[PDB]
Amino acid sequence: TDTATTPQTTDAPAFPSNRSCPYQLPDGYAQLRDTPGPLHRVTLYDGRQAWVVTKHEAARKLLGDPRLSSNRTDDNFPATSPAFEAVRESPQAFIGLDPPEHGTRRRMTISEFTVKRIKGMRPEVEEVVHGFLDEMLAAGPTADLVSQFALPVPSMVICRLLGVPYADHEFFQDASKRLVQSTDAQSALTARNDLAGYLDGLITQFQTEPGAGLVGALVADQLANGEIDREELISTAMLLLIAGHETTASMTSLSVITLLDHPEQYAALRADRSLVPGAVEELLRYLAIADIAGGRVATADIEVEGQLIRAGEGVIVVNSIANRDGTVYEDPDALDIHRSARHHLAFGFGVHQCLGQNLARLELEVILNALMDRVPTLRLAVPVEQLVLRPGTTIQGVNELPVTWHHH
Ligand code: HEM
C-alpha cells in the first residue's frame, strides 16, 4: 500500500494542542494567534473541520451572538475528544442551554454566588485554606501540592455551598477527576453515572429530611414545584461540583509554578499584598485553563469580517489565544502582575460567563496570601521539566506537583 509522498503542511491544523510549558501557548496556538483574521480552520480528533476564534474582540462578539448555540446534544457540536460523546448523550445543565431556558435554570443557582454571599464566605475559605496548610506543613518535609492542598480546599468549599457531605470526598473527588480527564467515552460515562447515582440518593434524602446548601434548596423549592426535573437537578449539581473542584485547583497549582518561574514578580507580590487581586486577574488571563469551555454550533449563517460561519458548523472560542491578543494586552506573552488584565476571557463573556468567577477570585486571593504568609520558602521539589501537564482536551493543569520548604 502506497503512503504519503507529498508535503504535509495543512491550513487546518489538528486541534486542540498540548501545552509543553504551563504558562505559554502551545506552538500551534502561537501560530493561530499570529495569523490575521478572527477565525481559523482546524481539524478535530475525528477528522471533522471546525472554526476557532483567535482574536479578543471577535471572541466577545461571537460569545454574545445568539446564533452560536451552546447545545452539546447537537450532532454538529464540536467534540474535541471521544469522551465528549458522553456529554452529547447525557442530560444537560444550563451550560448547555440557550436562552430562554438557560436563564430559568441559571437563576435557580445565582443566589449562592452573589458578591454579598462570596464576601460572607471569606472566613470559611480562610479557615479551610489554613487548615489544609496546617496539615500539609506538619505531615512531612515534602508534599504533593495537588492532592494535599490545591484540590481539597476548593472541594470542601464547594461541597459546603452545595450541601454535599465531605465525608464522601474520596468517592466524588475520584469520580470528578475521572470524568473531567477521561479520554474515552466509556470511562467518562461510568464516572458520570457514578456521580449521578450519588446525587440521586442525596436528593431523596433531602426529600425525607430537608437539607442545607444549594442542593437542599433546589429539592425543597424548584423540584417540589416541578420547575426543574430531577435529572436536571442532578446535572446542575454535578456541573457545580466538578467546576468548583477542578478549576480552582488547577489555577492554584499552575499559579505556583508560574510565580516561582517569575521570582521578581512573586517577591513584589509578597511585599505589597494590595497587588494580589490584580495578580490573580493576570494569572487568570495568562493561564486561561478552560479552552475546553468555548465550543459552540452555528444555527444560522454568521458573517465575521469577510469570513462566513455556515449553519451547522462548529466553532470553538479559544480564550487562551484571545487572551494573548497584543491589540488588547501589550506584550501579551509576558507575565506582568502590574498590567491591566481587565476584559480578559478566561471566564468567557455574555450569558454563559462563569457563574463561579468571583468565588474563584476569592479562593485564589486567600490561597496566594496564605502561601506567602505561611510558606514563604515554598519551592518545587523537582525541576519544571519533570512535571507532566494535562493534554489540551481537558482543563489545563498538573496532576502532581512535588513541593518542599523550610522545616518548622
Ligand atoms: C477557577 C477558575 C475558573 C475558570 C477559568 C472558569 C472558566 C469558565 C468558562 C470559560 C466558562 C464559560 C463556558 C461557556 O461559555 O460555555 C465557565 C462557565 C461556568 N463556570 Fe466557571 N471557571 C472557573 C471557576 C468556576 C467555579 C469555582 C465554579 C463553581 C461552581 C464555576 C462554575 C461555572 C458554571 C456553572 C458555568 C456555566 C455558566 C453558564 O452556562 O451560565 N466555575 N467557567
Ligand SMILES: O=C(O)Cc1ccccc1Nc1c(Cl)cccc1Cl
Ligand atoms: O462542561 C460540562 O458539561 C462538564 C465538564 C466536563 C469535563 C470537563 C469540563 C467540564 N465543564 C467545565 C467547563 Cl465547560 C468550564 C469550566 C469548568 C468545567 Cl468543569
